[PDB]
Amino acid sequence: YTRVVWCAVGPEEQKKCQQWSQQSGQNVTCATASTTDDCIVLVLKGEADALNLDGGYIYTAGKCGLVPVLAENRKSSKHSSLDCVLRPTEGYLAVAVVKKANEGLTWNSLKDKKSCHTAVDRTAGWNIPMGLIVNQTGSCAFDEFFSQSCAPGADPKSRLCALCAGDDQGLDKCVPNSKEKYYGYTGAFRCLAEDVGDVAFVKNDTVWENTNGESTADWAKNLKREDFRLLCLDGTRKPVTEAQSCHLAVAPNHAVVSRSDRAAHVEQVLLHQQALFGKNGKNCPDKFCLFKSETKNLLFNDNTECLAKLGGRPTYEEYLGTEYVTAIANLKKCSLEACAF
């Protein structure tokens, strides 16, 4: 009744979820699926209650009647007066990132280069950059723009998966879960850093979190911010310090979603879980921390300070905003109102 079933995507989220479940005295239990879409289907059936979604997936889920419940909020320099839970969310910066050493690569010379995407259907990794590229090219053949990519969730035999690596054993090439080596923000940035691709479509925060000693992960140990450049829409290249003047869009924060009839109960439970396991929680450093997973963004983004109440009790369309929503609608007309399942 007052027990919430979390949906985990893939085996590593399942493991973190199992630890959370144990620590919460089974106030939270876990269902697992191989993809985010499969998790949304579990929620629709009533077999799971909730999961934290990227903006692009909130759009999929919303068309099926799921609703935003609480949003990730990270640290801000403005609005510092208000408590984290009550503070408005700011949104993250979607950016395109290249190596400094790859000279003369600009936004206007991306055609036939190698790209690294978080996953198909995601905001910074897919919807924003491909929407821009479709508009600019006047063509829906975005699968022929780049010579080779890693875009988890695309056909494994296509060029959109050519650069994906799969797991330790080479299995699960291009699956949109953290088994794929180049999945997610961190995976797409790794694909760039290892020089598999020429450009990575990620958010501003990923670059900072994985450079200048901020990670310690073996591939990121020695990465320096100065070795990277952002691509701006005016054809220039800028240091990573200038993302406020050199980004592709501001994205709505990742948010917990649930079935409408469950929303109120999911919200109550999660507010109490973060008091126990969130940033300054009673049990975090000691027993368990909800918002940590060694740079791997499992369940929630590691930079999350708290989950925030929404206010204006927004629908999915209001939460995402009219800007972003019409961008996805236009791109989706390349690949009609209804749930996708």
Ligand X SMILES: *[C@@H]1O[C@H](CO)[C@@H](O[C@@H]2O[C@H](CO)[C@@H](O[C@@H]3O[C@H](CO[C@@H]4O[C@H](CO)[C@@H](O)[C@H](O)[C@@H]4O)[C@@H](O[C@H]4O[C@H](CO)[C@@H](O)[C@H](O)[C@@H]4O)[C@H](O)[C@@H]3O)[C@H](O)[C@H]2NC(C)=O)[C@H](O)[C@H]1NC(C)=O
Ligand Y SMILES: *[C@@H]1O[C@H](CO)[C@@H](O[C@@H]2O[C@H](CO)[C@@H](O[C@H]3O[C@H](CO)[C@@H](O[C@@H]4O[C@H](CO)[C@@H](O[C@H]5O[C@H](CO)[C@@H](O[C@@H]6O[C@H](CO)[C@@H](O)[C@H](O)[C@@H]6O)[C@H](O)[C@@H]5O)[C@H](O)[C@@H]4O)[C@H](O)[C@@H]3O)[C@H](O)[C@H]2NC(C)=O)[C@H](O)[C@H]1NC(C)=O
Ligand Z SMILES: *[C@@H]1O[C@H](CO)[C@@H](O[C@@H]2O[C@H](CO)[C@@H](O)[C@H](O)[C@H]2NC(C)=O)[C@H](O)[C@H]1NC(C)=O
Binding residues vs ligand X (CB under 6 A)? 131-132, 135, 322-323, 326-327, 330
Partner touching 131 among Fe ion, ligand RAM, ligand X, none, CB below 5 to 8 Å by kind = ligand X
Q: Is 225 annotated as a binding residue?
A: no
Q: Is 255 annotated as a binding residue?
A: no
Q: Is 124 annotated as a binding residue?
A: yes
Are 166 and 179 a contacting pair, CB within 8 Å? yes
* Per CB under 6 A, 243 contacts ligand Y: yes
For ligand RAM, the closer of residues 310 and 327 by Cβ is 310
Are 282 and 275 a contacting pair, CB within 8 Å? yes
Q: Which token pair is 47?
A: 């077999």
Q: Is 1 annotated as a binding residue?
A: no
Q: Which residue's C-beta sits nearest to ligand X?
A: 131
Q: Which of residues 31-60 bind Fe ion (CB under 5 A)?
A: 54
By CB under 6 A, which span of 200-208, 226-234, 289-297, 326-334 interacts with ligand Y? 200-208
The closest alpha carbon to 302, from 15, 31, 51, 72, belongs to 72
CA 141 vs. chain centroid, Å, equals 24
Q: Which token pair is 1?
A: 């009744």
The closest alpha carbon to 230, from 195, 184, 189, 186, belongs to 189
C-alpha span between 173 and 330 (Å, rounded)? 29
What type of residue sits at position 156? Answer: P
* Per CB under 6 A, 251 contacts ligand Y: no
Q: Is 92 annotated as a binding residue?
A: yes
DSSP assignment letter at 252: P
* Per CB under 6 A, 205 contacts ligand Y: yes
What type of residue sits at position 136? Answer: Q
Are 272 and 28 a contacting pair, CB within 8 Å? no
By CB under 5 A, which span of 108-116, 124-132, 218-226, 312-320 interacts with Zn ion? 312-320
How many Cα atoms sit within 13 Å of 249 on the Cβ side?
A: 23
Q: Binding residues for ligand Z, per CB under 6 A?
A: 2, 24-25, 27, 276
* Per CB under 5 A, 89 contacts Fe ion: no
Q: Is 122 annotated as a binding residue?
A: yes
| Strand 148-150, strand 92-99: pairing | unpaired
Q: What radius of gyration, in Å, describes the C-alpha atoms of the chain?
A: 19
Q: Is 49 annotated as a binding residue?
A: no
CB of 235 to Fe ion, least distance (A): 25
C-alpha span between 165 and 176 (Å, rounded)? 12
Partner touching 80 among ligand Y, Zn ion, Fe ion, none, CB below 5 to 8 Å by kind = ligand Y
* x-or-dash string of contact with ligand Y, 294-323, rule CB under 6 A: ---------x--------------------
* Per CB under 5 A, 177 contacts Fe ion: no
For Zn ion, the closer of residues 103 and 318 by Cβ is 318
Residues 6+ apart with CB under 8 A from 280: none
DSSP assignment letter at 232: P
The DSSP bridge partners found for residue 99 are: 228
For Fe ion, the closer of residues 21 and 127 by Cβ is 127
Partner touching 93 among ligand X, ligand RAM, ligand Y, none, CB below 5 to 8 Å by kind = ligand Y
CB of 305 to ligand Y, least distance (A): 9
C-alpha span between 162 and 155 (Å, rounded)? 10
Partner touching 123 among Fe ion, ligand Y, ligand Z, none, CB below 5 to 8 Å by kind = Fe ion
Inter-helix orientation angle 36-45/55-62, to 10°:
40
Q: Is 254 annotated as a binding residue?
A: yes
Question: Binding site membership: which residues?
Answer: 54, 92, 118, 122, 124-125, 185, 254
| Residues near Fe ion (CB under 5 A) | 54, 123
Residues contributing to the annotated binding site for hydrogencarbonate: 118, 122, 124-125
